[PDB]
C-alpha cells in the first residue's frame, strides 16, 4: 500500500519526470538530492546513447506499463530502474499529462510490488550512488 517507502520512490521519479519535461531543476523538491543527481545523470546518458532505439520502440504504440512490467519480470537492478525511468521520461516528452502521476505511479508499483524489500535493503535511492 502507499506507505513511507512508496512515496520515497514515487516522489523521486515524479520530480525527475517533471525536470526532464520542463528543464527546470527539481533536486530541491526531493529528500535525497544527492541520489537524485545520480539518477538524472544516468538517465541522461542512457537517452543520449539509445534514443534512436527508444524512438523505434515507441513507434509501436504499446502501453508503456506493459513494457515496464516485462523489464522487471525476472530480476531488478539499478541499471534496470534507471533505464525504465529514462525510457518513460523520454516517452512522456514525445507526447501536460505527466503531471497526473500515472507514469511515476506505474514505475513505483512495478518496482515495489515485487522488489520492496530489495529497495529498502538498498537504503532506498542511496544504492544508486554506486554510479556516482
Amino acid at each position: 500500500m502507499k506507505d513511507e517507502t512508496y512515496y520515497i520512490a514515487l516522489n523521486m521519479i515524479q520530480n525527475y519526470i517533471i525536470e526532464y519535461n520542463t528543464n527546470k531543476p527539481r533536486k530541491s523538491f526531493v529528500i535525497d538530492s544527492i541520489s537524485y543527481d545520480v539518477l538524472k545523470a544516468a538517465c541522461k546518458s542512457v537517452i543520449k546513447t539509445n534514443y534512436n532505439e527508444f524512438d523505434i520502440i515507441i513507434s509501436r504504440n504499446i502501453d508503456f506499463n506493459v513494457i515496464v512490467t516485462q523489464v522487471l519480470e525476472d530480476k531488478i537492478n539499478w541499471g534496470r530502474i534507471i533505464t525504465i525511468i529514462a525510457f518513460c521520461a523520454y516517452y512522456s516528452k514525445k507526447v501536460p499529462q505527466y503531471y497526473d502521476g500515472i507514469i511515476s505511479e506505474a514505475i513505483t508499483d512495478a518496482i515495489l510490488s515485487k522488489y520492496r524489500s530489495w529497495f529498502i535493503d538498498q537504503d532506498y535511492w542511496n544504492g544508486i550512488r554506486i554510479y556516482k
Binding site: 532505439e53 520502440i57 513494457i67 523489464v71 541499471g79
Partner: peptide, 22 residues
C-alpha cells in the same frame, strides 16, 4: 506475449551493460 518481451530484452540489454560499465 512476444513483442513486449522482445522490447523488454532491448531495455534489459541497455540496463545490464550500463550496470556493467558503471
Amino acid at each position: 506475449a512476444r513483442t513486449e518481451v522482445q522490447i523488454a530484452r532491448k531495455l534489459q540489454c541497455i540496463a545490464d551493460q550500463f550496470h556493467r560499465l558503471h
